[PDB]
Amino acid sequence: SKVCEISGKRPIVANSIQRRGKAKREGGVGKKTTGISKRRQYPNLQKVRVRVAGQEITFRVAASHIPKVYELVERAKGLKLEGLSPKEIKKELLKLL
Amino acid sequence: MKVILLEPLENLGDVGQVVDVKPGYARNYLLPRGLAVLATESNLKALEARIRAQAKRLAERKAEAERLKEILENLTLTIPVRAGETKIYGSVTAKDIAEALSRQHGVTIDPKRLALEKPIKELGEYVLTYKPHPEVPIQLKVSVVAQ
RNA sequence: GAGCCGGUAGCGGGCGUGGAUCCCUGGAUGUCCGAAUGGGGGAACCCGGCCGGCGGGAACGCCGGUCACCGCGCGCGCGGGGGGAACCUGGGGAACUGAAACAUCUCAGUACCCAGAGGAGAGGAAAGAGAAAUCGACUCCCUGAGUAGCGGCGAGCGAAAGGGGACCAGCCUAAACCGUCCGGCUUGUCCGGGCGGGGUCGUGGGGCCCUCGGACCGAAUCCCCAGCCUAGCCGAA
RNA sequence: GUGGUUCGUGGAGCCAUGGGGGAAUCUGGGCGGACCACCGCCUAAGGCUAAGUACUCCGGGUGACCGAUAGCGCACCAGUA
RNA sequence: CGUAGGGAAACCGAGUCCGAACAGGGCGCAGCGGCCGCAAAGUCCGCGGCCGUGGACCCGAAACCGGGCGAGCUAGCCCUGGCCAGGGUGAAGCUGGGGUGAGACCCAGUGGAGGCCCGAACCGGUGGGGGAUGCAAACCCCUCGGAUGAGCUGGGGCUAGGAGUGAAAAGCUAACCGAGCCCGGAGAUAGCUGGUUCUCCCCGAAAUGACUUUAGGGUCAGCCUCAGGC
RNA sequence: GCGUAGGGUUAGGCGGGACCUAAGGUGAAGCCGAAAGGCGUAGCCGAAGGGCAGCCGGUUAAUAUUCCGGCCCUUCCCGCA
RNA sequence: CUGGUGUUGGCUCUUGGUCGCGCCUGCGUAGGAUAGGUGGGAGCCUGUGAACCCCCGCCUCCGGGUGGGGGGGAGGCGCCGGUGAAAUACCACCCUGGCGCGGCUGGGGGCCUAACCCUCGGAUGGGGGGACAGCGCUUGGCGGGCAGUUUGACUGGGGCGG
RNA sequence: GGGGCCUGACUGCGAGGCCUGCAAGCCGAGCAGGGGCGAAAGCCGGGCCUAGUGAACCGGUGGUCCCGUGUGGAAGGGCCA
Ligand SMILES: [Mg+2]
Ligand SMILES: [Mg+2]
Ligand SMILES: [Mg+2]
Ligand SMILES: [Mg+2]
Ligand SMILES: [Mg+2]
Ligand SMILES: [Mg+2]
Ligand SMILES: [Mg+2]
Ligand SMILES: [Mg+2]
Ligand SMILES: [Mg+2]
Ligand SMILES: [Mg+2]
Ligand SMILES: [Mg+2]
Ligand SMILES: [Mg+2]
Ligand SMILES: [Mg+2]
Ligand SMILES: [Mg+2]
Ligand SMILES: [Mg+2]
Ligand SMILES: [Mg+2]
Ligand SMILES: [Mg+2]
Ligand SMILES: [Mg+2]
Ligand SMILES: [Mg+2]
Ligand SMILES: [Mg+2]
Ligand SMILES: [Mg+2]
Ligand SMILES: [Mg+2]
Ligand SMILES: [Mg+2]
Ligand SMILES: [Mg+2]
Ligand SMILES: [Mg+2]
Ligand SMILES: [Mg+2]
Ligand SMILES: [Mg+2]
Ligand SMILES: [Mg+2]
Ligand SMILES: [Mg+2]
Ligand SMILES: [Mg+2]
Ligand SMILES: [Mg+2]
Ligand SMILES: [Mg+2]
Ligand SMILES: [Mg+2]
Ligand SMILES: [Mg+2]
Ligand SMILES: [Mg+2]
Ligand SMILES: [Mg+2]
Ligand SMILES: [Mg+2]
Ligand SMILES: [Mg+2]
Ligand SMILES: [Mg+2]
Ligand SMILES: [Mg+2]
Ligand SMILES: [Mg+2]
Ligand SMILES: [Mg+2]
Ligand SMILES: [Mg+2]
Ligand SMILES: [Mg+2]
Ligand SMILES: [Mg+2]
Ligand SMILES: [Mg+2]
Ligand SMILES: [Mg+2]
Ligand SMILES: [Mg+2]
Ligand SMILES: [Mg+2]
Ligand SMILES: [Mg+2]
Ligand SMILES: [Mg+2]
Ligand SMILES: [Mg+2]
Ligand SMILES: [Mg+2]
Ligand SMILES: [Mg+2]
Ligand SMILES: [Mg+2]
Ligand SMILES: [Mg+2]
Ligand SMILES: [Mg+2]
Ligand SMILES: [Mg+2]
Ligand SMILES: [Mg+2]
Ligand SMILES: [Mg+2]
Ligand SMILES: [Mg+2]
Ligand SMILES: [Mg+2]
Ligand SMILES: [Mg+2]
Ligand SMILES: [Mg+2]
Ligand SMILES: [Mg+2]
Ligand SMILES: [Mg+2]
Ligand SMILES: [Mg+2]
Ligand SMILES: [Mg+2]
Ligand SMILES: [Mg+2]
Ligand SMILES: [Mg+2]
Ligand SMILES: [Mg+2]
Ligand SMILES: [Mg+2]
Ligand SMILES: [Mg+2]
Ligand SMILES: [Mg+2]
Ligand SMILES: [Mg+2]
Ligand SMILES: [Mg+2]
Ligand SMILES: [Mg+2]
Ligand SMILES: [Mg+2]
Ligand SMILES: [Mg+2]
Ligand SMILES: [Mg+2]
Ligand SMILES: [Mg+2]
Ligand SMILES: [Mg+2]
Ligand SMILES: [Mg+2]
Ligand SMILES: [Mg+2]
Ligand SMILES: [Mg+2]
Ligand SMILES: [Mg+2]
Ligand SMILES: [Mg+2]
Ligand SMILES: [Mg+2]
Ligand SMILES: [Mg+2]
Ligand SMILES: [Mg+2]
Ligand SMILES: [Mg+2]
Ligand SMILES: [Mg+2]
Ligand SMILES: [Mg+2]
Ligand SMILES: [Mg+2]
Ligand SMILES: [Mg+2]
Ligand SMILES: [Mg+2]
Ligand SMILES: [Mg+2]
Ligand SMILES: [Mg+2]
Ligand SMILES: [Mg+2]
Ligand SMILES: [Mg+2]
Ligand SMILES: [Mg+2]
Ligand SMILES: [Mg+2]
Ligand SMILES: [Mg+2]
Ligand SMILES: [Mg+2]
Ligand SMILES: [Mg+2]
Ligand SMILES: [Mg+2]
Ligand SMILES: [Mg+2]
Ligand SMILES: [Mg+2]
Ligand SMILES: [Mg+2]
Ligand SMILES: [Mg+2]
Ligand SMILES: [Mg+2]
Ligand SMILES: [Mg+2]
Ligand SMILES: [Mg+2]
Ligand SMILES: [Mg+2]
Ligand SMILES: [Mg+2]
Ligand SMILES: [Mg+2]
Ligand SMILES: [Mg+2]
Ligand SMILES: [Mg+2]
Ligand SMILES: [Mg+2]
Ligand SMILES: [Mg+2]
Ligand SMILES: [Mg+2]
Ligand SMILES: [Mg+2]
Ligand SMILES: [Mg+2]
Ligand SMILES: [Mg+2]
Ligand SMILES: [Mg+2]
Ligand SMILES: [Mg+2]
Ligand SMILES: [Mg+2]
Ligand SMILES: [Mg+2]
Ligand SMILES: [Mg+2]
Ligand SMILES: [Mg+2]
Ligand SMILES: [Mg+2]
Ligand SMILES: [Mg+2]
Ligand SMILES: [Mg+2]
Ligand SMILES: [Mg+2]
Ligand SMILES: [Mg+2]
Ligand SMILES: [Mg+2]
Ligand SMILES: [Mg+2]
Ligand SMILES: [Mg+2]
Ligand SMILES: [Mg+2]
Ligand SMILES: [Mg+2]
Ligand SMILES: [Mg+2]
Ligand SMILES: [Mg+2]
Ligand SMILES: [Mg+2]
Ligand SMILES: [Mg+2]
Ligand SMILES: [Mg+2]
Ligand SMILES: [Mg+2]
Ligand SMILES: [Mg+2]
Ligand SMILES: [Mg+2]
Ligand SMILES: [Mg+2]
Ligand SMILES: [Mg+2]
Ligand SMILES: [Mg+2]
Ligand SMILES: [Mg+2]
Ligand SMILES: [Mg+2]
Ligand SMILES: [Mg+2]
Ligand SMILES: [Mg+2]
Ligand SMILES: [Mg+2]
Ligand SMILES: [Mg+2]
Ligand SMILES: [Mg+2]
Ligand SMILES: [Mg+2]
Ligand SMILES: [Mg+2]
Ligand SMILES: [Mg+2]
Ligand SMILES: [Mg+2]
Ligand SMILES: [Mg+2]
Ligand SMILES: [Mg+2]
Ligand SMILES: [Mg+2]
Ligand SMILES: [Mg+2]
Ligand SMILES: [Mg+2]
Ligand SMILES: [Mg+2]
Ligand SMILES: [Mg+2]
Ligand SMILES: [Mg+2]
Ligand SMILES: [Mg+2]
Ligand SMILES: [Mg+2]
Ligand SMILES: [Mg+2]
Ligand SMILES: [Mg+2]
Ligand SMILES: [Mg+2]
Ligand SMILES: [Mg+2]
Ligand SMILES: [Mg+2]
Ligand SMILES: [Mg+2]
Ligand SMILES: [Mg+2]
Ligand SMILES: [Mg+2]
Ligand SMILES: [Mg+2]
Ligand SMILES: [Mg+2]
Ligand SMILES: [Mg+2]
């Protein structure tokens, strides 16, 4: 229920459509809409605790790009990173995206 | 997920082998505990490479030795010593053998590698294994004679 | 170019050809509040740290300078914060009403809220349009047309191509390949991250590899100028 | 599962994407209204880009616009009493 | 826009559609004088009446919705303080005596409990009369309830619009609360009521029928009117 | 208690600050939300609670525990013991 | 509330389907005898030691089959013809069903731990829960808790009746 | 009322009219196609008659082979019942 830190995904808005009756293709009169109401669709966000530079880094990223986190990590090896703090190692990774 | 292993894991895969397992198992267990690596591209070349060197050096030695052998195999180590008849007074050791091959034939060696538990004490004609590289032995005939 | 000290006369005193008042551009000063930012705060109030000065000055007080938070970049530098009548784009987003009731539908993604930008904003150089065997980025107006189609085919909704006009313009990167600086351990023909070169297209193009051949284009950034703006002046009888 | 387009599931493609599965580099791939083939158009998943366009707090010109119950709520010390 | 129409369409075309048809039927097809002039289909701009779309003749709702403002009145709670004259009854407990095997328990003194009692301040508002363009958009007088409790009260706070509080009356939430107020969508909608401004001249109605979630509103016909034609 | 003009409010000790904490308010760290914003130990803000050293009298047309008088007290800076 | 899937992993047991192999198994007149099908097909067997005797399982349509183990240890079945629709030694490819290893999955049981969640003056860690729960896309249901509306006209006033 | 052979309980149209606000509902000679009863003239487009019914929208089934969204097909439609 927020924003992927890797994909920039974000809660979009979708309608909840309610339909009744038989379709045409099933040899029926056709579908009928009985009630449309906005919903909202969330990205399947999850936590991703990783340890980098002897420091724990956790992302609130959607389940889609989870394998990108480790990529960032894997890609971050070539960086002066010791001595830094968590928020510092995060920002340094994100800059790789 | 295809992964690269860092330590052989029972009934799973040999060190350096590449297997395909459940992503949950790979990233919540094998990668944390330094037990394996993503079969990526980046740190997939680094595996394709160290096999070369490790195959290059071994292939190097197993040739820097065959190069040796041919040096030996076509010659004989003669050792003069003081003795009456077939039993020697002193003794001829590998370190002794070393001096010779160093002395004559301008070759250097490691006595420890040479196979010869008991220091020779009687004369005759001997063939002894040097064992410079396993699976790659040598047969060096040494003529120990007196005077 | 002869009067002036605002609307405003008077009391009381001045100034102006040694060119004032007045008008236009630049500069200085500019208490206190306000994004307000040293700290607090019931805005314009209250209380501090540091460096330097004043007073007879140590306590007390005044004066000048500096001290909030955030992002980015190798404690110090550039930037942000807020305001603006509507106009613009993005994130959200109703209802009365219409359907002569009403739920799909309409009103309408309009009103409104929020973030952002700017003198404009958006869009924009085809993974387009769509039947011409053709067109050639995008934007706007006309027209195409209330056509095609959409619709409890009810009320109602409503295009695009093409054509005629305004304007006119096209570019930089990413990846392969060459080189270089750094750091990681699992020692290289390695992987990773910076920078530079190279490259950017659809008759497909580009790299590397041979082979043949070796000046004309030109900016949207910079500079000089005319032109224009912000006070004015001459002006027949 | 939705949103946009004239398209209200309709035969429903095209553009966009919240969820799942998940490739390729020109012998590639998206498109031409479900789908298949032929024939054609284009070349996504990085970005920038003047003018022609919109508004009017501001200044100016002009009206078969008003003329103090009109014209802006205010012609005057008005967003005031 | 017009010059060609017919058909659901391919498609034919002064014809075409249903059809086997040369049949029958539907919708269609053709200026005036003496080349000239004149008239005209059509089309274009003006003017006029009327219709469609927009607030569409003017004013008026009760209500719906969106974003903001309000708990300085009132309701509940939180934090901190304050107030309750005087008099009356006289619980447990204690002391002692009687009492018994020890007790329970009975009496006298002490003692001072209680959403206890009477009565001011404070808080309330039972009944009556006055008041009624009032002193007052809830007041005055007499009587009356509670009055150490679930009490009253100052000050600083928090909770709000389909939401808050509510010892519960749908009461209260800034003097009208069955969903507050302001501003906006907005000129909402109103088939209802009202209102519609100079003069003269000619004609001159209807209040019926049919259908109508229609019956005090509308569509067609009927009755009125105007221009042209017969 | 209205119109015009002039005059009048004097604190180291009375009240509030440079002292403190309450409900509550805000709010390093940290958490949450399409934006706006909503939470949140510490810390800060927050009073009619806590803490802190002035009592009597005289004076003016108008102020005084504020000026005057007498008698007391607080805190801070420097210096001596 | 709920099934499927993402977050979401490890090991073993017991069952279900699949492909891979060892395999084995199929019963009418007729016909040596218990014929799975289409072949290939007139020779295949033994020191990879034969007719025939005995010992264990296997299926048993009660007749046999097969695997076997010992003795002996060198013979036996094909075409020929009996025979039937189809016919036999032998060599493949497929079925019937059934058995064990391997695959790959679906259920159920049990246990881990590392994701995830709670907790611990100590926090790259300890401890409990535990791949369930929470959460995301999705299916279906319950659902006046709230939301938008409908609840007809004629009528000797409306309603009831008609 | 009885019985014989029969399917006109037709297809393609249909002059002219009743009724009439619209839309509907009603009668209908005759022409061709192909048939039935009759010797023939002739009758027959269901029933002596007047009620036995329901407009459009949406969709089902058979047929037609009209359109087919670059082209040939298909999806989906239109016409007939
Ligand atoms: Mg849904
Ligand atoms: Mg169909
Ligand atoms: Mg529908
Ligand atoms: Mg995770
Ligand atoms: Mg995935
Ligand atoms: Mg990327
Ligand atoms: Mg003056
Ligand atoms: Mg004077
Ligand atoms: Mg000053
Ligand atoms: Mg400040
Ligand atoms: Mg502040
Ligand atoms: Mg100083
Ligand atoms: Mg001073
Ligand atoms: Mg200062
Ligand atoms: Mg701004
Ligand atoms: Mg928008
Ligand atoms: Mg809403
Ligand atoms: Mg509505
Ligand atoms: Mg309206
Ligand atoms: Mg209407
Ligand atoms: Mg409307
Ligand atoms: Mg309506
Ligand atoms: Mg209506
Ligand atoms: Mg209604
Ligand atoms: Mg709309
Ligand atoms: Mg918007
Ligand atoms: Mg802002
Ligand atoms: Mg702004
Ligand atoms: Mg411009
Ligand atoms: Mg731009
Ligand atoms: Mg391009
Ligand atoms: Mg047109
Ligand atoms: Mg038109
Ligand atoms: Mg219709
Ligand atoms: Mg619309
Ligand atoms: Mg165009
Ligand atoms: Mg054009
Ligand atoms: Mg122009
Ligand atoms: Mg051009
Ligand atoms: Mg490099
Ligand atoms: Mg090429
Ligand atoms: Mg440029
Ligand atoms: Mg002049
Ligand atoms: Mg839609
Ligand atoms: Mg459908
Ligand atoms: Mg759709
Ligand atoms: Mg289109
Ligand atoms: Mg998606
Ligand atoms: Mg191709
Ligand atoms: Mg391809
Ligand atoms: Mg595509
Ligand atoms: Mg596609
Ligand atoms: Mg396609
Ligand atoms: Mg296309
Ligand atoms: Mg197509
Ligand atoms: Mg092709
Ligand atoms: Mg194209
Ligand atoms: Mg591309
Ligand atoms: Mg852009
Ligand atoms: Mg621009
Ligand atoms: Mg422009
Ligand atoms: Mg102007
Ligand atoms: Mg005038
Ligand atoms: Mg005038
Ligand atoms: Mg006036
Ligand atoms: Mg006025
Ligand atoms: Mg006047
Ligand atoms: Mg005709
Ligand atoms: Mg005719
Ligand atoms: Mg004419
Ligand atoms: Mg006209
Ligand atoms: Mg009209
Ligand atoms: Mg309107
Ligand atoms: Mg009007
Ligand atoms: Mg009005
Ligand atoms: Mg109104
Ligand atoms: Mg309502
Ligand atoms: Mg409501
Ligand atoms: Mg209160
Ligand atoms: Mg109060
Ligand atoms: Mg109460
Ligand atoms: Mg208290
Ligand atoms: Mg108290
Ligand atoms: Mg009392
Ligand atoms: Mg008492
Ligand atoms: Mg006691
Ligand atoms: Mg006693
Ligand atoms: Mg008492
Ligand atoms: Mg009492
Ligand atoms: Mg009492
Ligand atoms: Mg009361
Ligand atoms: Mg009373
Ligand atoms: Mg009362
Ligand atoms: Mg009374
Ligand atoms: Mg009386
Ligand atoms: Mg009374
Ligand atoms: Mg009375
Ligand atoms: Mg009143
Ligand atoms: Mg009253
Ligand atoms: Mg009284
Ligand atoms: Mg009393
Ligand atoms: Mg009383
Ligand atoms: Mg009481
Ligand atoms: Mg009492
Ligand atoms: Mg109390
Ligand atoms: Mg109180
Ligand atoms: Mg209070
Ligand atoms: Mg208060
Ligand atoms: Mg509140
Ligand atoms: Mg409300
Ligand atoms: Mg509201
Ligand atoms: Mg609100
Ligand atoms: Mg409520
Ligand atoms: Mg109010
Ligand atoms: Mg009220
Ligand atoms: Mg209401
Ligand atoms: Mg009120
Ligand atoms: Mg507003
Ligand atoms: Mg409106
Ligand atoms: Mg209404
Ligand atoms: Mg008059
Ligand atoms: Mg009538
Ligand atoms: Mg009708
Ligand atoms: Mg009806
Ligand atoms: Mg009536
Ligand atoms: Mg009429
Ligand atoms: Mg006439
Ligand atoms: Mg007085
Ligand atoms: Mg006075
Ligand atoms: Mg006077
Ligand atoms: Mg005086
Ligand atoms: Mg004093
Ligand atoms: Mg003080
Ligand atoms: Mg101080
Ligand atoms: Mg404090
Ligand atoms: Mg807060
Ligand atoms: Mg707090
Ligand atoms: Mg402090
Ligand atoms: Mg205090
Ligand atoms: Mg105090
Ligand atoms: Mg004190
Ligand atoms: Mg004090
Ligand atoms: Mg004292
Ligand atoms: Mg005084
Ligand atoms: Mg001392
Ligand atoms: Mg799952
Ligand atoms: Mg367990
Ligand atoms: Mg789960
Ligand atoms: Mg979560
Ligand atoms: Mg559902
Ligand atoms: Mg209810
Ligand atoms: Mg219900
Ligand atoms: Mg409700
Ligand atoms: Mg309701
Ligand atoms: Mg409504
Ligand atoms: Mg009625
Ligand atoms: Mg009737
Ligand atoms: Mg009646
Ligand atoms: Mg009556
Ligand atoms: Mg009546
Ligand atoms: Mg009647
Ligand atoms: Mg009834
Ligand atoms: Mg008969
Ligand atoms: Mg008969
Ligand atoms: Mg016959
Ligand atoms: Mg007729
Ligand atoms: Mg008629
Ligand atoms: Mg009928
Ligand atoms: Mg005939
Ligand atoms: Mg005949
Ligand atoms: Mg006959
Ligand atoms: Mg007839
Ligand atoms: Mg009948
Ligand atoms: Mg009969
Ligand atoms: Mg009926
Ligand atoms: Mg309908
Ligand atoms: Mg036809
Ligand atoms: Mg086609
Ligand atoms: Mg065709
Ligand atoms: Mg073909
Ligand atoms: Mg076909
Ligand atoms: Mg079809
Ligand atoms: Mg069809």
The DSSP line for chain A is ----TTT----B--EEEEEES--TTTTSS--EEEEEEE--B---EEEEEEEETTEEEEEEEETTSHHHHHHHHHHHTSS--TT--HHHHHHHHHTT-
Q: Taking CB atoms and an 8 Å cut-off, how many pairs form between chains A and B?
A: 11
Question: What Å distances lie between residue A56 and A90, A93, B24, CA to CA?
Answer: 10, 13, 19
Find the helix or strand (DSSP H, E) in which B146 lies.
strand B139-146
Instruction: Single out the residue of B52, B28, B27 nearest to residue B39, CA to CA.
Output: B27
Within a 10 A sphere around the Cβ of B99, how many other Cβ atoms? 14
Q: Compute the distance between CA of residue B25 and CA of residue B31 in angstroms, rounded to an integer.
A: 9
Q: Mark yes or no for CB contact B38/A74 under 8 Å.
A: yes
Q: How far apart are CA B79 and CA B142, in angstroms?
A: 7
- Nearest 10 degrees: Cα torsion B76, B82, B87, B89: -130
CB B30 within 8 A of CB B18: no
Technique of determination:
X-ray
Which residue shows structure tokens 């001595």?
A83
> What is the three-class DSSP state of B81?
strand
CA dihedral B36, B40, B46, B47 (to 10 degrees): 60
With a 7 Å cutoff on the CB, does A17 touch strand D? Answer: yes
DSSP class of residue B39 equals -
- Given the DSSP bridges, would you call strands B120-122 and B124-129 parallel, antiparallel or unpaired? unpaired
